[PDB]
Amino acid sequence: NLVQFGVMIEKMTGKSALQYNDYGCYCGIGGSHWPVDQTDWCCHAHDCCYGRLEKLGCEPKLEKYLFSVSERGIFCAGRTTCQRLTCECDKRAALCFRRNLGTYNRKYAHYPNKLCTGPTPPC
Ligand SMILES: Cc1c(C(=O)C(N)=O)c2c(OCC(=O)O)cccc2n1Cc1cccc2ccccc12
Ligand SMILES: [Ca+2]
Ligand SMILES: [Cl-]
């Protein structure tokens, strides 16, 4: 489930994984309408990533993988290809979060779902 991804987020962003829970309109379970900012797009893309893995027969919500963080980046591993794929989806998201640290806004943390409006952009 969520333990490894939370650890990855904390390592790459310096924030608790709680700070990306219910962030904007996409971070947290599900999501809909238009992303509020770049961080939120990371989560929209991550949702898309997981949907791709589900079509491949993986269960990314549950897969347990292994990873380390050296200086040259995040190294992903696991017994199965589905575990390694899930790690790749998470990696891209954690890197996306880090890259957009400059526009992270606390006002979007724990965002009320009523404030999510507009169309839902496709994957
Ligand atoms: C950032 C994020 C997520 C995403 O990347 C996203 N795209 O929605 C995420 C998440 O995404 C998958 C989904 O939308 O089904 C589900 C639950 C918590 C999530 N979180 C928050 C979160 C991430 C990692 C570890 C957590 C541990 C405890 C509580 C919340 C945690
Ligand atoms: Ca989501
Ligand atoms: Cl295993």
From Swiss-Prot:
It comes from the Eukaryota. Disulfide bonds join C25-C116, C27-C43, C42-C96, C48-C123, C49-C89, C58-C82, C76-C87. It is an enzyme of class 3 (hydrolase). Changing D22 to A/K: Significantly decreases the catalytic efficiency. GO terms for molecular function: calcium ion binding; calcium-dependent phospholipase A2 activity; phospholipase A2 activity; phospholipid binding. The keyword Metal-binding applies. Induction: Up-regulated by inflammatory cytokine IL1B. SMART domains: PA2c. It is found in: Secreted; Cytoplasm. Its EC number is 3.1.1.4. GO terms for cellular component: cytoplasm; extracellular region. Ca(2+) 1 binds at Y26, G28, G30, D47. The keyword Transport does not apply. Restricted to the brain, heart, lung, and placenta. It catalyses: a 1,2-diacyl-sn-glycero-3-phosphoethanolamine + H2O = a 1-acyl-sn-glycero-3-phosphoethanolamine + a fatty acid + H(+); 1-hexadecanoyl-2-(9Z-octadecenoyl)-sn-glycero-3-phosphoethanolamine + H2O = 1-hexadecanoyl-sn-glycero-3-phosphoethanolamine + (9Z)-octadecenoate + H(+); 1-hexadecanoyl-2-(9Z,12Z-octadecadienoyl)-sn-glycero-3-phosphoethanolamine + H2O = 1-hexadecanoyl-sn-glycero-3-phosphoethanolamine + (9Z,12Z)-octadecadienoate + H(+); 1-hexadecanoyl-2-(5Z,8Z,11Z,14Z-eicosatetraenoyl)-sn-glycero-3-phosphoethanolamine + H2O = 1-hexadecanoyl-sn-glycero-3-phosphoethanolamine + (5Z,8Z,11Z,14Z)-eicosatetraenoate + H(+). The active site is at H46, D90. Binds 2 Ca(2+) ions per subunit. One ion binds at a conserved binding site (GCXCG), whereas the second ion binds at a flexible site and may act as a supplemental electrophile as well as a backup. Ca(2+) 2 binds at D22, G24, Y111, N113. Keywords: Calcium, Cytoplasm, Disulfide bond, Hydrolase, Inflammatory response, Lipid metabolism, Metal-binding, Phospholipid metabolism, Secreted, Signal. GO terms for biological process: arachidonate secretion; inflammatory response; lipid catabolic process; low-density lipoprotein particle remodeling; phosphatidylcholine metabolic process; phosphatidylglycerol metabolic process; phospholipid metabolic process. Optimum pH is 7-9. Belongs to the phospholipase A2 family. Secretory calcium-dependent phospholipase A2 that primarily targets extracellular phospholipids. Hydrolyzes the ester bond of the fatty acyl group attached at sn-2 position of phospholipids (phospholipase A2 activity), releasing various unsaturated fatty acids including oleoate, linoleoate, arachidonate, docosahexaenoate and lysophosphatidylethanolamines in preference to lysophosphatidylcholines. This is Group IIE secretory phospholipase A2. The lineage of its organism: Eukaryota, Metazoa, Chordata, Craniata, Vertebrata.
